[PDB]
Short mmCIF file of C-alpha atoms and ligand atoms in Angstrom, two decimals:
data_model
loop_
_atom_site.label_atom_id
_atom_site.label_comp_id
_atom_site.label_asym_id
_atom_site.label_seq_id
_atom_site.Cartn_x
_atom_site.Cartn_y
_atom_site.Cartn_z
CA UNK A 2 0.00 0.00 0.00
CA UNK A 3 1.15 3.61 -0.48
CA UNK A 4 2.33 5.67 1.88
CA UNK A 5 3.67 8.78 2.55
CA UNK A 6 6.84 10.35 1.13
CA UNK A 7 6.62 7.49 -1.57
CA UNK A 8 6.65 5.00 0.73
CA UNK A 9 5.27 1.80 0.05
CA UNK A 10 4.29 -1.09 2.86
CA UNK A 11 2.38 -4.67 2.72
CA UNK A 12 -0.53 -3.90 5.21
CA UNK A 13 -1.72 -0.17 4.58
CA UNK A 14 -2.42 0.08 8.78
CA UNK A 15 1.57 0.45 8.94
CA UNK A 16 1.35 3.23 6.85
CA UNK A 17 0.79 5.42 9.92
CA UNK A 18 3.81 4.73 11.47
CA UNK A 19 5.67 6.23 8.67
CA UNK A 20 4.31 9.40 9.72
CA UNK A 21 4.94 8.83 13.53
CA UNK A 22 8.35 8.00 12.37
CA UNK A 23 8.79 11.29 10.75
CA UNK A 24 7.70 13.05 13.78
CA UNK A 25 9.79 11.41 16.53
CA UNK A 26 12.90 11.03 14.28
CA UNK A 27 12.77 14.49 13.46
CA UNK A 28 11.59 15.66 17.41
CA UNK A 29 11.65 13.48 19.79
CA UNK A 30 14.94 12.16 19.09
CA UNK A 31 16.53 15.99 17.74
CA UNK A 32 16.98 14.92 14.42
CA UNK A 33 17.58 10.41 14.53
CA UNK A 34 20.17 10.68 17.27
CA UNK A 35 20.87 8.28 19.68
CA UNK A 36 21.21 10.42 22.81
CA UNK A 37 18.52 11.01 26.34
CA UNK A 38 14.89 10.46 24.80
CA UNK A 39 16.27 6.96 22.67
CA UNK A 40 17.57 6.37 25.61
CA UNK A 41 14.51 7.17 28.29
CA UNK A 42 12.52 5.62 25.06
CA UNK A 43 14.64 1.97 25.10
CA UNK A 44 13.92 2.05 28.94
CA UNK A 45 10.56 2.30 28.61
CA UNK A 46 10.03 -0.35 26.80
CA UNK A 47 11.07 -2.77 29.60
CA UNK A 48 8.87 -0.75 32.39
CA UNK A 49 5.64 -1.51 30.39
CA UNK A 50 6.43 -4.50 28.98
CA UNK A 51 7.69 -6.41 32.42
CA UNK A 52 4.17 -6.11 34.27
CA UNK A 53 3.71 -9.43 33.51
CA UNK A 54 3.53 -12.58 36.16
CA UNK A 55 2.06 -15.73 35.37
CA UNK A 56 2.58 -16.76 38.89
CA UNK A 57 0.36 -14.14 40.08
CA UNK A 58 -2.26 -15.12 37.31
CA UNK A 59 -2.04 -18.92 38.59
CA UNK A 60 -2.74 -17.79 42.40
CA UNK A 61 -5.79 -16.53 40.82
CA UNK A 62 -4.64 -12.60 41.07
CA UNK A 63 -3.90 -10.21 38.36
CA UNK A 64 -0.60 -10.73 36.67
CA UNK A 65 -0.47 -7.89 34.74
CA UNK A 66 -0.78 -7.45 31.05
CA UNK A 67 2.77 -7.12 29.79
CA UNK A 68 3.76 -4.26 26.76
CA UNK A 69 0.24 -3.07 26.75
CA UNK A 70 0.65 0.48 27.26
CA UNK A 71 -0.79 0.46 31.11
CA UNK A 72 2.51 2.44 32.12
CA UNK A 73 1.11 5.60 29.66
CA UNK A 74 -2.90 4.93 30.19
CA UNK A 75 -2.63 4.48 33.81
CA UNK A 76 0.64 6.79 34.65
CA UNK A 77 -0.67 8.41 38.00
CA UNK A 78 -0.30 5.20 39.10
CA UNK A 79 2.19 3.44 37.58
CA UNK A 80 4.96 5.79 37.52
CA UNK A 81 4.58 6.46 41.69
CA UNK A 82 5.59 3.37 41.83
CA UNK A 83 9.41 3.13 43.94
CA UNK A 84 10.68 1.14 40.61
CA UNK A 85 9.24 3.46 38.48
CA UNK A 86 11.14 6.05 39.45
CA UNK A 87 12.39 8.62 36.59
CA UNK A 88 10.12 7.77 34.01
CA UNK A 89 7.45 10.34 34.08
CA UNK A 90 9.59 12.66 32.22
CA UNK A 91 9.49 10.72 28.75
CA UNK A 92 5.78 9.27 29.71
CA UNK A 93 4.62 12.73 29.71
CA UNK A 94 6.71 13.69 26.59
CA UNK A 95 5.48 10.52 24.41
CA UNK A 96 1.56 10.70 25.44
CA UNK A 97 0.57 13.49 23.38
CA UNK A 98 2.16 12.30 20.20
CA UNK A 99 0.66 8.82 20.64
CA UNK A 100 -2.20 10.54 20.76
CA UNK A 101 -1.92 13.42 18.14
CA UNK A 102 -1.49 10.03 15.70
CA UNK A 103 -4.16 8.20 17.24
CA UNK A 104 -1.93 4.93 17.70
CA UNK A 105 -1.80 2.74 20.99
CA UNK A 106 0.07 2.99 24.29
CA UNK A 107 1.65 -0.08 23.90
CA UNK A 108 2.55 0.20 20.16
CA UNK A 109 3.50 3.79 20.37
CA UNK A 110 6.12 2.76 23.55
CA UNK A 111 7.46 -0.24 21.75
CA UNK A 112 8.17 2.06 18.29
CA UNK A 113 9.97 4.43 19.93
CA UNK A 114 12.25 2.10 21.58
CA UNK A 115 12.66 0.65 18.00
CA UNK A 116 12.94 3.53 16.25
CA UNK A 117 15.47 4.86 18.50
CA UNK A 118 17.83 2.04 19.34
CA UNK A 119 18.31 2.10 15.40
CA UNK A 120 19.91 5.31 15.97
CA UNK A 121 22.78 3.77 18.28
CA UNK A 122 26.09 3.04 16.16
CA UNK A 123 26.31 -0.33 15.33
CA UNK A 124 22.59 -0.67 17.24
CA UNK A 125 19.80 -3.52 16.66
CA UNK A 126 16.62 -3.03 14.29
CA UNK A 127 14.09 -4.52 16.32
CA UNK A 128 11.26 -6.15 15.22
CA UNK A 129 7.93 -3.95 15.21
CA UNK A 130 4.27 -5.49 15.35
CA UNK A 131 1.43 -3.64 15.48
CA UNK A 132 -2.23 -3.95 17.36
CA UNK A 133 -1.88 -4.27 20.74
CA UNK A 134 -5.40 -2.75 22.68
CA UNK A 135 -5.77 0.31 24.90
CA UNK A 136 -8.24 -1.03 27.00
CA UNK A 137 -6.32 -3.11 30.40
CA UNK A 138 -5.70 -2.55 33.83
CA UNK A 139 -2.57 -0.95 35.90
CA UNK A 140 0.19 -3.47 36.80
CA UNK A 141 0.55 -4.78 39.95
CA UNK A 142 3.12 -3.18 42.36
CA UNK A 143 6.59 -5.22 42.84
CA UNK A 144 6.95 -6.43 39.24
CA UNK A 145 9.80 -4.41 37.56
CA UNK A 146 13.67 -5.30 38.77
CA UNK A 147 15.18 -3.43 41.17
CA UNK A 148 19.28 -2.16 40.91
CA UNK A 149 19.56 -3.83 44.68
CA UNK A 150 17.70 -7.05 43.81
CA UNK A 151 19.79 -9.95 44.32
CA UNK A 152 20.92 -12.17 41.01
CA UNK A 153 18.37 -14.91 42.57
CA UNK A 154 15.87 -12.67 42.39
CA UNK A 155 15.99 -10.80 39.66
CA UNK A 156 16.56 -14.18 37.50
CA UNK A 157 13.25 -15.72 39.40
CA UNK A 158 11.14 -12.54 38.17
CA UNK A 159 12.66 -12.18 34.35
CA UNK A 160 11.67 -15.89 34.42
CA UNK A 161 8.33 -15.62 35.19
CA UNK A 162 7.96 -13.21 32.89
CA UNK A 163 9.38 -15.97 30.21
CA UNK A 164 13.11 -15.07 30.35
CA UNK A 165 16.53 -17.48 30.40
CA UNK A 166 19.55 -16.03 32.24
CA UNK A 167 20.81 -15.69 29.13
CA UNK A 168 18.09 -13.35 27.55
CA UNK A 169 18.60 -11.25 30.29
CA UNK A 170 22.22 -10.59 29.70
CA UNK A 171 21.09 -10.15 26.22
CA UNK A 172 18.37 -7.57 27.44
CA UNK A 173 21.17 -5.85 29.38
CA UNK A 174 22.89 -5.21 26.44
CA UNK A 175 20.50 -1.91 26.48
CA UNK A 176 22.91 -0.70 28.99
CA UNK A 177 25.95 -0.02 26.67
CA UNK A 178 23.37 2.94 25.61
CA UNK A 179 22.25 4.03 28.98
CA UNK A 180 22.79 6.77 31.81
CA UNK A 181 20.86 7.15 35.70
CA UNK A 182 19.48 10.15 36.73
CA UNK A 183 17.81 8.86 40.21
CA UNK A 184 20.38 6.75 41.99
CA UNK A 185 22.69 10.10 42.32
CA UNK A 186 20.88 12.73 41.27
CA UNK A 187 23.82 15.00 41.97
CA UNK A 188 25.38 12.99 38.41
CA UNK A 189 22.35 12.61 36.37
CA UNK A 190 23.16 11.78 33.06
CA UNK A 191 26.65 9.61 33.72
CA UNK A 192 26.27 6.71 31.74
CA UNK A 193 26.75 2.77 32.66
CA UNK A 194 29.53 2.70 29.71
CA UNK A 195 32.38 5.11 27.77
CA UNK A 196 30.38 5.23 24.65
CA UNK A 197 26.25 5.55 25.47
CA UNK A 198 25.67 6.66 22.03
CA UNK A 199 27.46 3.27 20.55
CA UNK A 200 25.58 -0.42 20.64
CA UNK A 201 28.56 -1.61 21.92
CA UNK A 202 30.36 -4.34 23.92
CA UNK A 203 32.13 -1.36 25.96
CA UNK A 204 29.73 -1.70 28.92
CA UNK A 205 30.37 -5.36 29.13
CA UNK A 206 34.17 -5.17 29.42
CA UNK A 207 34.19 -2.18 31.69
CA UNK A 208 31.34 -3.87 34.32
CA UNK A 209 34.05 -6.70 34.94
CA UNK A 210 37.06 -3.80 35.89
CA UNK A 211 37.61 -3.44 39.80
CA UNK A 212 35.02 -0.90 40.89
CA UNK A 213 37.65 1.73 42.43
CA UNK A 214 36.23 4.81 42.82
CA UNK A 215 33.55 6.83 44.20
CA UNK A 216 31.82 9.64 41.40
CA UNK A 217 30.22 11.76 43.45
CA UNK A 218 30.26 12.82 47.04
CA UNK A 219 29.50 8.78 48.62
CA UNK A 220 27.39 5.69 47.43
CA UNK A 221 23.92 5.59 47.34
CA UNK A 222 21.20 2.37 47.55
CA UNK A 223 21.47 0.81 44.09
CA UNK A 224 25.18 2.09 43.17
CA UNK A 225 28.91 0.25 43.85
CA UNK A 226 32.26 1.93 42.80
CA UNK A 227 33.17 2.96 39.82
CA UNK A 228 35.91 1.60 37.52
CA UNK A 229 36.63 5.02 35.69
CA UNK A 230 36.19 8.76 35.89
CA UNK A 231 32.62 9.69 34.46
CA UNK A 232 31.19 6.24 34.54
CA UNK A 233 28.08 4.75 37.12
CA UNK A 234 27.88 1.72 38.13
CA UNK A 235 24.64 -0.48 39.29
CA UNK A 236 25.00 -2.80 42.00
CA UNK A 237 23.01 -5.62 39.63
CA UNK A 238 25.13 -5.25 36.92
CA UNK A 239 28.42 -5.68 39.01
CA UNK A 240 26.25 -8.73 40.63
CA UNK A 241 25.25 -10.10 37.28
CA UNK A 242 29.10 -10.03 35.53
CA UNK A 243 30.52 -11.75 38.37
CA UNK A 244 27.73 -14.44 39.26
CA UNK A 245 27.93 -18.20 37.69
CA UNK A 246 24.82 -18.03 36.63
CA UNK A 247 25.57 -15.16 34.20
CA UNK A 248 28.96 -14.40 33.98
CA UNK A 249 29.57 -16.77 30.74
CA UNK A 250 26.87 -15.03 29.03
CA UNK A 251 27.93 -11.49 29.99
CA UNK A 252 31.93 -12.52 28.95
CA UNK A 253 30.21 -14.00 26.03
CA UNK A 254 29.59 -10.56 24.37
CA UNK A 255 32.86 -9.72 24.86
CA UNK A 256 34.32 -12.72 22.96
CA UNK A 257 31.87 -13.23 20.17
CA UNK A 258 30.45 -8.82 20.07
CA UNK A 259 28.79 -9.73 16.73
CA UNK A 260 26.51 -12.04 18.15
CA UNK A 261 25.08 -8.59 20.74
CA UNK A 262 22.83 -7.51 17.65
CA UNK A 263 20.88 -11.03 17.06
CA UNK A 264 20.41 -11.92 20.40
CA UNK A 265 19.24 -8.48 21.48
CA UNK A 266 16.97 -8.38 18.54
CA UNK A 267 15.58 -11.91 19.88
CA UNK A 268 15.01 -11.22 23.17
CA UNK A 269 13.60 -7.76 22.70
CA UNK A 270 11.08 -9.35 19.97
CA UNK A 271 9.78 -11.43 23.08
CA UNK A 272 9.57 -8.61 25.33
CA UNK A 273 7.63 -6.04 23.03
CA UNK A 274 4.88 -8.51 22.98
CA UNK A 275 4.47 -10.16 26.42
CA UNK A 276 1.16 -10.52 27.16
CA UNK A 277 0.00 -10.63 23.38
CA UNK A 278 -0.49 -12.76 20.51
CA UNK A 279 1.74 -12.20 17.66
CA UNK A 280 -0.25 -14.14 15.12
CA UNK A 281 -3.13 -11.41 16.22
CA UNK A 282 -1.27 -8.01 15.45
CA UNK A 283 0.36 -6.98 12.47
CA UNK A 284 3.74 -7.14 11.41
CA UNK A 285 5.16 -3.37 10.36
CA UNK A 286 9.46 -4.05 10.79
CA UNK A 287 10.18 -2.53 7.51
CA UNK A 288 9.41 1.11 8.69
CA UNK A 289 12.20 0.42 11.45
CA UNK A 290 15.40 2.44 9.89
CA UNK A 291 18.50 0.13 8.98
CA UNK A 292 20.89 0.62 11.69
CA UNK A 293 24.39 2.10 10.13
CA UNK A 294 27.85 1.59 11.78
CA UNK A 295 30.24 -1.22 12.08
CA UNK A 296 30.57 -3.77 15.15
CA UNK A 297 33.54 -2.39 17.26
CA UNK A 298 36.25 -4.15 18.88
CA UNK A 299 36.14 -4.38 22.23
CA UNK A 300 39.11 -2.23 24.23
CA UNK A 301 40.40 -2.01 27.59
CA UNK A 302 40.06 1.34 28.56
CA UNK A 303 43.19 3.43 28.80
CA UNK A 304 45.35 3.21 31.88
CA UNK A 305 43.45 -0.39 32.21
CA UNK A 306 45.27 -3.48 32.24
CA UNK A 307 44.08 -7.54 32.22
CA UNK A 308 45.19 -7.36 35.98
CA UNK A 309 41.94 -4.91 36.57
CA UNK A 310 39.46 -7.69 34.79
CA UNK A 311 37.90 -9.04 37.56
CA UNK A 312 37.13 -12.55 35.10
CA UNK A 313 34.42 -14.31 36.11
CA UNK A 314 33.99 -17.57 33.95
CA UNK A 315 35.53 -20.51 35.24
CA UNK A 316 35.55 -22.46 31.18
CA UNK A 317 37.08 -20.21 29.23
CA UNK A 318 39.31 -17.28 29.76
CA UNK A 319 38.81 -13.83 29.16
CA UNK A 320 39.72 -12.70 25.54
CA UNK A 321 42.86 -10.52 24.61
CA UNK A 322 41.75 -7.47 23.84
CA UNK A 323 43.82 -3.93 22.33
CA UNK A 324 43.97 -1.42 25.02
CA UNK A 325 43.51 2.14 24.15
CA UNK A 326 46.49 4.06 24.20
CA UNK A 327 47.92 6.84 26.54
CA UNK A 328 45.48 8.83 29.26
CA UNK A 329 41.85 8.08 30.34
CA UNK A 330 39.69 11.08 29.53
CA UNK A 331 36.69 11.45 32.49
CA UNK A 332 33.65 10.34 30.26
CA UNK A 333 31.00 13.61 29.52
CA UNK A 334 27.09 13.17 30.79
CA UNK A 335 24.89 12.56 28.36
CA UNK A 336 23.57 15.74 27.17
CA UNK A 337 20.93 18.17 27.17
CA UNK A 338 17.39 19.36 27.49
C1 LIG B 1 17.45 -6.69 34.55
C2 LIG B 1 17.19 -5.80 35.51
C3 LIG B 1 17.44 -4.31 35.25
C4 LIG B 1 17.73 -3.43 36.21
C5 LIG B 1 17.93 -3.71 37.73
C6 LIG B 1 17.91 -2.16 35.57
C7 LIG B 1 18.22 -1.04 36.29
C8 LIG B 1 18.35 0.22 35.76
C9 LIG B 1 18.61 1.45 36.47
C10 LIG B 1 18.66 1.55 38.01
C11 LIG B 1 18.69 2.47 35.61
C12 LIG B 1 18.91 3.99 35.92
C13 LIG B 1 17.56 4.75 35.97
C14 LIG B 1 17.80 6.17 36.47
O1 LIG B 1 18.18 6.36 37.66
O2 LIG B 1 17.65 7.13 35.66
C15 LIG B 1 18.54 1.91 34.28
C16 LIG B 1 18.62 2.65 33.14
C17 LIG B 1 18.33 2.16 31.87
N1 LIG B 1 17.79 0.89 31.64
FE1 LIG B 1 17.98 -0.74 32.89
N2 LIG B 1 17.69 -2.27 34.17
C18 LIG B 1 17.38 -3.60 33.98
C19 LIG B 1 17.01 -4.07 32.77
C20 LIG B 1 16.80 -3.26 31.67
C21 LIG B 1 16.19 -3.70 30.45
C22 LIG B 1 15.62 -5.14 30.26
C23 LIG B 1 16.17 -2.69 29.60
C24 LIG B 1 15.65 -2.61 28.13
C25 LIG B 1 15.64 -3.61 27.25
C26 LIG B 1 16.80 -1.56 30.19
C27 LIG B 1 17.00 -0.34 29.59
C28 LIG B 1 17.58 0.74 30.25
C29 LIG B 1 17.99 1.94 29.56
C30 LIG B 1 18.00 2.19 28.03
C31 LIG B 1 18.50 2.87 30.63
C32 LIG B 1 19.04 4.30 30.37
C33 LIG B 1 17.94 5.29 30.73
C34 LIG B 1 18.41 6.73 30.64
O3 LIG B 1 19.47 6.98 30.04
O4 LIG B 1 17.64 7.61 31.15
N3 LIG B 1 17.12 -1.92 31.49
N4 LIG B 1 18.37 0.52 34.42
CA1 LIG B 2 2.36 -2.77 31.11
CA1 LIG B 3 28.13 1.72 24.53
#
């Protein structure tokens, strides 16, 4: 069917996304970058999709109903929630284009986090379906991760939810384009890797360094030291490098960085649509821009050495990587406004 621009697309209902394209590649995201919104955006994604517990659904209680917008539709509530915190900022920014093109919650959050990962050098296209209803409840309480979970616990909720330790390393990739704002507000904006606007394997190697220093003025609930100038680190994510049941996985991206794309794209594919039926939306990928930039070799950062890898998995040692000559450089917040 024909589309705008002289676009063309299988179903003519994708057609619309075309436009909402236009607009949040153009405003949302200042003109396709890969920078705050893409990443508030990717984030999202996750917050809306993870209310979602069979468990709960089996003890004859509401589970949730996964990536079905109830995060946007039912914000007051949802976003007041302690693991919520931070994300009423790009709730409130995406809700009125959502509705200015008259598309769904749920879609509209899943697109954007499409849409803008694509952005990212090197970064996924993710798989976009179309359909999902506004009409469900708010998620329960207690469902979305927490930075001070422990690894048994975040593993038991991502897999009720439907997730193997594995996909959750893979989901974690998000975090090579990622900052915080809410565990130390006094350094909102310092991201979890050197390179937040690169899909990269960066935030894997430097979440196995010694943590060694403290970025701002102490630690806070959520946070553990940090291995370079610039950088935050999550107490989970140090957790999750280190722990057996993860830590071949996480190394794995390290060793192997071209397979970060695929099994991002995989697990993400799963996420966007828990609580729906595939086979009963509408498939609209194509409008998802080609991601542009090559897969990087990993580096040690410089002033780094193997003796600050902190290698966690027992069958196979940690790869040799280049290490980046002369003087680390403190890495800059994410920008802007
Ligand atoms: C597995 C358990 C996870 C935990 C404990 C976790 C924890 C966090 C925390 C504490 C932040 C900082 C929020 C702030 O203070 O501003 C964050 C940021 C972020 N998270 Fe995760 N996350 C997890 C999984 C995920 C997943 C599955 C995704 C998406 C697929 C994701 C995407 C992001 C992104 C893109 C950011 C950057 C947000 C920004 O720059 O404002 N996270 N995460
Ligand atoms: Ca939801
Ligand atoms: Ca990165």
């Amino acid at each position: 069917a024909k589309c705008s621009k002289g676009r063309t697309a299988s179903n003519d209902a994708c057609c619309v996304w075309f436009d909402v394209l236009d607009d949040i590649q153009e405003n949302l995201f200042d003109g396709g970058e890969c920078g705050e919104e893409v990443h508030e955006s990717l984030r999202l994604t996750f917050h809306d999709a993870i209310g979602f517990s069979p468990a709960l659904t089996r003890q004859g209680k509401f589970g949730g109903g996964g990536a079905d917008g109830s995060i946007m539709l039912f914000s007051d509530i949802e976003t007041n929630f302690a693991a919520n915190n931070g994300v009423d900022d790009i709730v409130e920014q995406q809700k009125p284009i959502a509705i200015k093109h008259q598309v769904s919650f749920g879609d509209f959050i899943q697109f954007a986090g499409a849409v803008g990962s694509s952005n990212c050098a090197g970064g996924p296209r993710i798989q976009f379906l179309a359909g999902r209803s506004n009409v469900t409840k708010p998620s329960p309480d207690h469902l979305v991760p927490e930075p001070f979970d422990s690894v048994t616990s975040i593993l038991a909720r991502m897999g009720d939810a439907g997730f193997k330790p594995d996909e959750v390393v893979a989901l974690l990739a998000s975090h090579s384009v990622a900052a915080q704002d809410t565990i130390d507000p006094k350094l909102a904006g310092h991201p979890f890797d050197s390179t937040p606007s690169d899909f990269d394997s960066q935030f894997f190697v430097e979440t196995l360094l010694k943590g060694t220093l403290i970025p701002g003025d102490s630690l806070h609930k959520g946070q553990v030291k940090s291995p370079l100038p610039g950088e935050f680190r999550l107490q989970s994510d140090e957790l999750l490098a280190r722990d057996s049941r993860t830590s071949c996985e996480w190394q794995s991206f390290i060793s192997n960085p071209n397979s970060m794309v695929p099994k991002f794209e995989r697990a993400m594919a799963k996420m966007a649509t828990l609580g729906q039926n595939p086979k009963k939306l509408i498939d609209c990928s194509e409008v998802i821009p080609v991601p542009r930039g090559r897969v990087k070799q990993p580096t040690l950062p410089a002033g780094k050495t193997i003796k600050d890898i902190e290698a966690s998995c027992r069958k196979a040692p940690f790869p040799r990587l280049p290490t980046d000559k002369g003087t680390f450089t403190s890495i800059l917040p994410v920008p802007s406004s």
